[PDB]
Amino acid sequence: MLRYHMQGFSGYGVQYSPFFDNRLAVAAGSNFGLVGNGKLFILEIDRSGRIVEVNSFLTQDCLFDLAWNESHENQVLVAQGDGTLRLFDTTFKEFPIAIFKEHEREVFSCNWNLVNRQNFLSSSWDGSIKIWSPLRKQSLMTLTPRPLEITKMVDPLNAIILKNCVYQAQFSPHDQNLVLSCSGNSYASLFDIRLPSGKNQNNFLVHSGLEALTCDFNKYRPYVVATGGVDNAIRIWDIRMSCINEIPNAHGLAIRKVTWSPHHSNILMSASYDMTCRIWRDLSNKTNSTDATKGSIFNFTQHSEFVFGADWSLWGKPGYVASTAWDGNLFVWNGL
């Protein structure tokens, strides 16, 4: 396995460059992301397999995610704990080229549009999702997850009677105008940005009433998504229908990341607080609940702290992945 160590920093997200086959970036934070600086690491893998830092940027607060600019080979976005997102050009040192400041709390995710390749998305502890152009200071659109069951039972004057978190959001790589998100209220939200606010979202219960931490679109099947969360299950859904497959007890503790393979329609990867990374076969593409091994393909166990970041290699031998964790390690390995 190929390795790189980030001294004193914990990995929260990792992504391969969409332009350079041997380049990846890691978003990290000091003190397990709880307090102190953040740091963006730009890493290169050479012919030998040695991972080398080619650039890095220290930030004021912890970094929770990153997204490479799908339209510019030298640009990469980070999501920061102070509610900002910051866009960097890797040619420069020290500072970003743009700061995006609207979120009121920690930004936990950011993702680039793969269809138009122009815009990006952010999701925040403030309960909102924002769509941005890198060329504009102000957001283009704000989306707020509001499940029908949640909304109905919550008192309208809730904010003034003393008695939520959007962990991940993603653009569909199939439909320019579809956005999927998962919230701490256990609902996945599906937005069609063509429709007006208050009438643009469908919501569904995904993780037992416990926090839903992660969601991802299938790269080959337009209506197929996966979710993961605090009930230790991976669920696979058909949005045009909704549970088509379930992997109960996929992990021993909460699942922080799920991500579908960009090489196969039936392969996905999960990362967990149980300090493992697992590769799964979607057997419905029969279910995983009935199979003797639950469609488990590979269990990567080398991380010694919570695994928060995982990404599939785009180019090269299909089945290579990068994972990062609260052990300060980035590992590159083949899950087959």
């Binding site: 004193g8 920093f9 000091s30 003190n31 397990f32 307090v35 102190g36 600086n37 220290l58 930030t59 004021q60 607060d61 050009d89 040619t91 420069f92 020290e94 500072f95 970003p96 080229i97 743009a98 700061i99 021993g252 503790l253 149980d274 300090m275 493992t276 166990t301 010694s304 702290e305 919570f306 609260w326 052990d327």
Partner: protein
């Protein structure tokens, strides 16, 4: 104080055979113990009373500077 409470709850909840051993040997869990006990507290830095010094990374101030539009 509130930080001490939360840390204690983590120690109590969460301290497979492989997973259990990994948690017992965890550096995060070790920090939770030290915050629970009152040794380590918030100085954007954490510090140990018994060591008198810093635990974890030093915080370095970072300006909200951006580069100008000088690069294609």
């Amino acid at each position: 104080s509130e930080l001490q409470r939360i840390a204690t709850d983590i120690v109590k909840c969460c301290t497979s055979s492989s997973v259990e051993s990994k948690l017992s040997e965890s550096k995060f869990i070790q920090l939770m113990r030290n915050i629970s006990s009152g040794d380590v507290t918030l100085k954007s830095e954490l510090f140990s009373s018994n060591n008198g010094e810093l635990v974890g990374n030093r915080h370095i101030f970072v300006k909200d500077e951006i580069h100008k539009d000088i690069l294609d």
